[PDB]
Design an enzyme around this catalytic site. Structure first.
Site, PDB file in Angstrom:
ATOM      1  N   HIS A  36      -4.164   7.040   0.044  1.00  0.00           N
ATOM      2  CA  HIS A  36      -2.928   7.417  -0.032  1.00  0.00           C
ATOM      3  C   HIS A  36      -1.977   6.540  -0.987  1.00  0.00           C
ATOM      4  CE1 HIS A  36       0.558   9.944   1.021  1.00  0.00           C
ATOM      5  NE2 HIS A  36       1.423   8.745   1.530  1.00  0.00           N
ATOM      6  N   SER A  77       4.456  11.409  -1.552  1.00  0.00           N
ATOM      7  CA  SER A  77       4.452  11.336  -0.224  1.00  0.00           C
ATOM      8  C   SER A  77       5.861  12.086   0.321  1.00  0.00           C
ATOM      9  CB  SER A  77       4.318   9.940   0.245  1.00  0.00           C
ATOM     10  OG  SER A  77       4.186   9.784   1.537  1.00  0.00           O
ATOM     11  N   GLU A  79      -6.817  11.057   1.543  1.00  0.00           N
ATOM     12  CA  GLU A  79      -5.350  10.861   1.917  1.00  0.00           C
ATOM     13  C   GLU A  79      -5.440  10.328   3.542  1.00  0.00           C
ATOM     14  OE1 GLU A  79      -2.760  11.262   0.296  1.00  0.00           O
ATOM     15  OE2 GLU A  79      -3.348  12.825  -1.604  1.00  0.00           O
ATOM     16  N   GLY A 132       7.621   6.844   1.297  1.00  0.00           N
ATOM     17  CA  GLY A 132       7.406   6.176   2.552  1.00  0.00           C
ATOM     18  C   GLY A 132       7.948   6.480   3.863  1.00  0.00           C
TER      19      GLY A 132
HETATM   20  C1  LIG Z   1       7.572  -0.023   8.019  1.00  0.00           C
HETATM   21  C2  LIG Z   1       7.166   0.218   9.191  1.00  0.00           C
HETATM   22  C3  LIG Z   1       6.611   0.574  10.409  1.00  0.00           C
HETATM   23  N1  LIG Z   1       4.945   0.225  10.159  1.00  0.00           N
HETATM   24  C4  LIG Z   1       4.114   0.852  11.202  1.00  0.00           C
HETATM   25  C5  LIG Z   1       4.257   2.378  11.174  1.00  0.00           C
HETATM   26  C6  LIG Z   1       3.644   2.695  10.129  1.00  0.00           C
HETATM   27  C7  LIG Z   1       4.410   1.913   8.683  1.00  0.00           C
HETATM   28  C8  LIG Z   1       3.816   2.270   7.366  1.00  0.00           C
HETATM   29  N2  LIG Z   1       3.944   3.540   7.236  1.00  0.00           N
HETATM   30  C9  LIG Z   1       2.373   4.295   7.266  1.00  0.00           C
HETATM   31  C10 LIG Z   1       1.303   3.333   6.830  1.00  0.00           C
HETATM   32  O1  LIG Z   1       0.833   3.494   5.717  1.00  0.00           O
HETATM   33  C11 LIG Z   1       1.526   3.543   4.398  1.00  0.00           C
HETATM   34  C12 LIG Z   1       4.694   4.331   6.999  1.00  0.00           C
HETATM   35  O2  LIG Z   1       5.919   3.969   6.754  1.00  0.00           O
HETATM   36  C13 LIG Z   1       4.633   5.843   6.772  1.00  0.00           C
HETATM   37  C14 LIG Z   1       4.896   6.565   8.084  1.00  0.00           C
HETATM   38  C15 LIG Z   1       4.614   8.004   8.010  1.00  0.00           C
HETATM   39  C16 LIG Z   1       4.434   8.684   6.850  1.00  0.00           C
HETATM   40  C17 LIG Z   1       4.264   9.905   7.054  1.00  0.00           C
HETATM   41  C18 LIG Z   1       3.982  10.617   6.135  1.00  0.00           C
HETATM   42  C19 LIG Z   1       3.692   9.930   4.484  1.00  0.00           C
HETATM   43  C20 LIG Z   1       3.938   8.416   4.660  1.00  0.00           C
HETATM   44  C21 LIG Z   1       4.206   7.813   5.813  1.00  0.00           C
HETATM   45  C22 LIG Z   1       4.025   6.366   5.728  1.00  0.00           C
HETATM   46  C23 LIG Z   1       4.523   0.539   9.060  1.00  0.00           C
END
Ligand SMILES: C#CCN1CCC[C@H](CN(CCOC)C(=O)c2ccc3ccccc3c2)C1
Ligand SMILES: *[C@@H]1O[C@H](CO)[C@@H](O[C@@H]2O[C@H](CO)[C@@H](O)[C@H](O)[C@H]2NC(C)=O)[C@H](O)[C@H]1NC(C)=O
Ligand SMILES: *[C@@H]1O[C@H](CO)[C@@H](O[C@@H]2O[C@H](CO)[C@@H](O)[C@H](O)[C@H]2NC(C)=O)[C@H](O)[C@H]1NC(C)=O
Ligand SMILES: *[C@@H]1O[C@H](CO)[C@@H](O[C@@H]2O[C@H](CO)[C@@H](O)[C@H](O)[C@H]2NC(C)=O)[C@H](O)[C@H]1NC(C)=O
Ligand SMILES: *[C@@H]1O[C@H](CO)[C@@H](O[C@@H]2O[C@H](CO)[C@@H](O)[C@H](O)[C@H]2NC(C)=O)[C@H](O)[C@H]1NC(C)=O
Ligand SMILES: *[C@@H]1O[C@H](CO)[C@@H](O[C@@H]2O[C@H](CO)[C@@H](O)[C@H](O)[C@H]2NC(C)=O)[C@H](O)[C@H]1NC(C)=O
Ligand SMILES: *[C@@H]1O[C@H](CO[C@@H]2O[C@@H](C)[C@@H](O)[C@@H](O)[C@@H]2O)[C@@H](O)[C@H](O)[C@H]1NC(C)=O
Ligand SMILES: *[C@@H]1O[C@H](CO)[C@@H](O)[C@H](O)[C@H]1NC(C)=O
Ligand SMILES: C[C@@H]1O[C@H](O)[C@@H](O)[C@H](O)[C@@H]1O
EC number: 3.1.1.8
Length: 527
Positions: free
Chosen positions: A436, A196, A323, A114
């Site tokens: 992903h 992740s 991914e 996350g």
């Molecule tokens: C909660 C929250 C914030 N919202 C906006 C920014 C993105 C967030 C969700 N999101 C990416 C969307 O795909 C899962 C992540 O929390 C996130 C952010 C950075 C990452 C970097 C590497 C791997 C996974 C990641 C997931 C949703």
């Protein structure tokens, strides 16, 4: 009555019916003192004792975090949101046990991802009862502090030292060593796995001398510590902490005054300000995440890897086919979950500005040239598929491959996989391919539930992945059966063999995406 005595008191569980068998589930065991008030931002404190019978029959509170709300009502995004109340009192863990109670079971420890800002152990795609039922292993998952509450870094100062979330994971591994025998488990056969930022976390436990005795083997899915999003330098982490002080009215002249100010803010006051500590930012930005704190990480991880100063054991590593696509709808122009998102060469170059903000005009032009040697000139979706490939190759695949080579160069068996099957239930459009984090349901055996509307080929694929993962945990070798099954060969830096995983045929291949990874390891660093 289902009761187990732990070194911290007795705990009551609950039976679950699975595939005509029983699984015993202990949801929400505390493993550290709640990091509340004065404990906010400090390493977790060992738990003393409760003097009764703790009822571990409902998932506990997920840690404080922002919530993805881009697509209300959309399962594809909301399935990743926490399904329990949010709270700073969140250092709990969950244990699933096959019935009848095993004598010396192998333990699998799940670490969610996350981006180090979000995640909880209580999601449905992390339910560990099928793995305990089908492979007779014990499954453990724990909550750890994410975001600034988990990785706020004033390096040196015990009041906010950095990597508090990794120390949360480590303290849960200590709990397994001290207590899992009371559940039927073998603390000498513990296998970390995660996806992740959870994979990044797993890879960092291989470097930290404090974790070296707390587990046996590791499985890394779609992630590693050498990925560009995974580790913050020492003073970028500090420069982000000081900025969070200024953003919340907490700037002071004494460091500990800054911290004692930050202890008096609402959690929500800190969450809402996390997104502004950084000037630029991409969809892959990690505002507060692991850093070189001198305690957990004594040095930059790439150096520790190159010097071979890490736990020598077996690993299992892999990536998914597509991914990068998941991050395109969260910020690139011309991309929506609700069209086929066909884009132009101009929109491609706008995307590259979104994901490579500090890269020179020449670097963006070099990435474009390397990713436009089309097979068919149109093919209208060429630029759509090249941007997902840039994002996934730079952030996930070439990091995983580079980590596997360098790790295997020191004498231990590594096995690499390439997950190529899109799940029939995938809530996202077909242009986003194998996204992903959507191998996860297969690893936890969700397609084994015949009452869940998965295809027969998806139950076979997931019965195969479950068996291999459990075999790797138990024996350091990801075999299925001795007979009538494709052999998974070790990854070696010369031949670089890997196994594809899909429903048609599992095949052995060589040098995954070598022509694209050559660009990211040997030409992009010089731009
Ligand atoms: C909660 C929250 C914030 N919202 C906006 C920014 C993105 C967030 C969700 N999101 C990416 C969307 O795909 C899962 C992540 O929390 C996130 C952010 C950075 C990452 C970097 C590497 C791997 C996974 C990641 C997931 C949703
Ligand atoms: C776990 O559950 C049991 C019952 O399922 C709880 O026992 C009750 O505890 C309260 C607290 O004083 C008593 O008033 C009740 O009479 C008890 N009932 C029974 C049937 O034992 C127990 O307290 C729970 N554990 C915790 C930590 O709350
Ligand atoms: C569970 O298995 C472990 C081994 O995985 C047993 O623990 C020790 O294993 C080492 C070798 O790694 C031996 O040198 C020790 O003699 C073992 N301990 C003992 C007490 O014999 C462990 O005994 C097993 N536990 C069971 C069967 O309950
Ligand atoms: C795909 O869907 C989106 C969603 O509406 C369309 O809209 C554009 O989305 C981009 C994404 O940042 C914005 O920059 C544009 O302003 C949006 N356009 C308008 C008119 O508001 C997008 O046009 C769709 N493309 C196709 C080919 O269907
Ligand atoms: C997968 O391969 C391993 C060998 O690495 C097999 O491990 C043996 O398993 C038996 C129990 O079935 C143990 O008693 C042996 O001590 C193990 N040997 C070694 C060298 O680890 C494992 O059985 C294989 N699994 C399948 C399903 O064929
Ligand atoms: C050996 O195991 C393989 C699994 O890898 C079996 O292959 C599948 O068998 C089913 C029939 O039950 C076919 O519908 C599939 O198309 C097969 N998959 C292939 C060929 O990739 C195979 O049947 C088994 N054979 C023996 C002799 O045990
Ligand atoms: C540290 O970061 C500075 C930028 O931070 C700015 O101020 C904070 C409060 C946030 O609001 C942020 O959005 C702003 O951009 C840089 O100006 C400075 O050069 C950086 N220094 C180092 C050493 O990294
Ligand atoms: C839980 O399961 C065990 C064996 O599966 C059984 O003996 C016990 O009675 C069950 N307890 C319940 C259903 O409360
Ligand atoms: C008698 C015991 O008291 C307590 C309950 O939570 C158990 O289910 C059991 O009934």
């Amino acid at each position: 009555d289902i009761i187990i005595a732990t070194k911290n008191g007795k705990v009551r569980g609950m039976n679950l019916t699975v595939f005509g068998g029983t699984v015993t589930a202990f949801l929400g065991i505390p493993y550290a003192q709640p990091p509340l008030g004065r404990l906010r931002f400090k390493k977790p404190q060992s738990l003393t004792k409760w003097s009764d019978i703790w009822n571990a029959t409902k998932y506990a509170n997920s840690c404080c975090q922002n919530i993805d709300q881009s697509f209300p009502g959309f399962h594809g995004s909301e399935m990743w949101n926490p399904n329990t109340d949010l709270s700073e009192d969140c250092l709990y863990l969950n244990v699933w046990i096959p019935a009848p109670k095993p004598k010396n079971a192998t333990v699998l420890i799940w670490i969610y991802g996350g981006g180090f800002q979000t995640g909880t152990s209580s999601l449905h795609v992390y339910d560990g009862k099928f793995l305990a039922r089908v492979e007779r292993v014990i499954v453990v998952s724990m909550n750890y502090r994410v975001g600034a509450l988990g990785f706020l870094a004033l390096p040196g100062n015990p009041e906010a030292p950095g990597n508090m979330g990794l120390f949360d994971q480590q303290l849960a591994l200590q709990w397994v060593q001290k207590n899992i025998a009371a559940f039927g488990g073998n603390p000498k056969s513990v296998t970390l796995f995660g996806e992740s930022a959870g994979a990044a976390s797993v890879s960092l436990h291989l470097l930290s001398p404090g974790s070296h005795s707390l587990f046996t083997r590791a499985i890394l899915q779609s992630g590693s510590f050498n990925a560009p999003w995974a580790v913050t330098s020492l003073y970028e982490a500090r420069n982000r902490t000081l900025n969070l002080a200024k953003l919340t009215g907490c700037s002071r002249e004494n460091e500990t005054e800054i911290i004692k100010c930050l202890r008096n803010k609402d959690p929500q006051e800190i969450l809402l300000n996390e997104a502004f500590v950084v000037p630029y930012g991409t969809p892959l930005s990690v505002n507060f995440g692991p850093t070189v704190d001198g305690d957990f990480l004594t040095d930059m991880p790439d150096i520790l890897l190159e010097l071979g100063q890490f736990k020598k054991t077996q690993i299992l590593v892999g990536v998914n086919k597509d991914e990068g696509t998941a991050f395109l709808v969260y910020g690139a122009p011309g991309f929506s979950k609700d069209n086929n998102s066909i884009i132009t060469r101009k929109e491609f170059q706008e995307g590259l500005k979104i994901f490579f903000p500090g890269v020179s005009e020449f670097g963006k032009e070099s990435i474009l040239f390397h990713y436009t040697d089309w097979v068919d000139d149109q093919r209208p979706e060429n630029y759509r598929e090249a941007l997902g490939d840039v994002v996934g190759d730079y952030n996930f695949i070439c990091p995983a491959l580079e980590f596997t080579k360098k790790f295997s160069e020191w004498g231990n068996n590594a096995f690499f996989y390439y997950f190529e099957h899109r799940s029939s239930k995938l809530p996202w459009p077909e242009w986003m391919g194998v996204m992903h984090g959507y191998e996860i349901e297969f690893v936890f055996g969700l397609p084994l539930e015949r009452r869940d509307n998965y295809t027969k080929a998806e139950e076979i694929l997931s019965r195969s992945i479950v068996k291999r993962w459990a075999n790797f945990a138990k024996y350091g070798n990801p075999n299925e059966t001795q007979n009538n099954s494709t052999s998974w060969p070790v990854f070696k830096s010369t031949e670089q063999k890997y196994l594809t995983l899909n429903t048609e045929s599992t095949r052995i291949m060589t040098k995954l995406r070598a022509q694209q990874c050559r660009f990211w390891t040997s030409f992009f660093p010089k731009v």
